[PDB]
Ligand binder design. Structure first.
Ligand SMILES: O=C1CCCCN1Cc1cccc(-c2ccsc2)c1
Length: 188
């Protein structure tokens, strides 16, 4: 058919009840994730085509980058809690992969300070139980699908995007095929 299980998406054999409608996972250590976000703008283009009433959730993962990877999951929790994802995503990706200036939790904190988050505000969030809970929520969602690779996107706990089955000769066409597939899946 036009959209086929095994081509543009795969189907989870253990569907996850109560999962977010559209769930993206990434790591700031993940090279394809840098491409998805900084070059292809996958999340934004998926969001822009989602049906009314379908919201997007994006979570960081621990399994890349050891200690610093876990610090980045916690910092992503701070970003979600403060609502500053759109201020820190670019400098976190560039700090880890472009300039390689993020080597410690303090260096992560510097990105937030430079982005205008006050030091007391960042530190209060970093140490908060609201943020511990958001870390737990990120870990649980990844565990629910036994996640071992990023980038990854899941729709309604049932379907997983399969970008490896899409033509990569034109970036723009690839992005809208991916977004159109997410829309299709959300309408199933
Ligand atoms: O290599 C793959 C195979 C599957 C799709 C995800 N990626 C990562 C990627 C990174 C940067 C650009 C592109 C791309 C798309 C269309 S033209 C160029 C693709």
């Amino acid at each position: 058919a036009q959209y086929e299980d095994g081509k543009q998406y795969t189907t989870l054999e253990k569907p996850v009840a109560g999962a977010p409608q559209v769930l993206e996972f990434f790591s700031f250590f993940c090279p394809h994730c840098y491409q998805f976000e900084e070059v292809l703008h996958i999340s934004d283009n998926v969001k822009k085509k989602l049906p009314e009433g379908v919201k997007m959730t994006k979570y960081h993962v621990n399994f890349m980058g050891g200690d610093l990877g876990k610090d980045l999951t916690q910092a992503w929790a701070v970003a979600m809690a403060l609502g500053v994802e759109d201020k820190v995503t670019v400098p976190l990706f560039e700090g880890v992969q472009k300039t390689q200036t993020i080597r410690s939790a303090s260096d992560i904190r510097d990105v937030f300070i430079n982005a205008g988050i006050k030091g007391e505000e960042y530190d209060a969030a970093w140490n908060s139980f609201v943020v511990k809970s958001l870390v737990a929520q990120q870990e649980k969602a990844a565990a629910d699908v036994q996640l071992r690779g990023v980038p990854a996107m899941f729709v309604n706990g049932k379907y997983q995007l399969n970008p490896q089955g899409m033509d990569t000769s034109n970036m723009d066409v690839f992005v809208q095929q991916y977004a159109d597939t997410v829309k299709y899946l959300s309408e199933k």
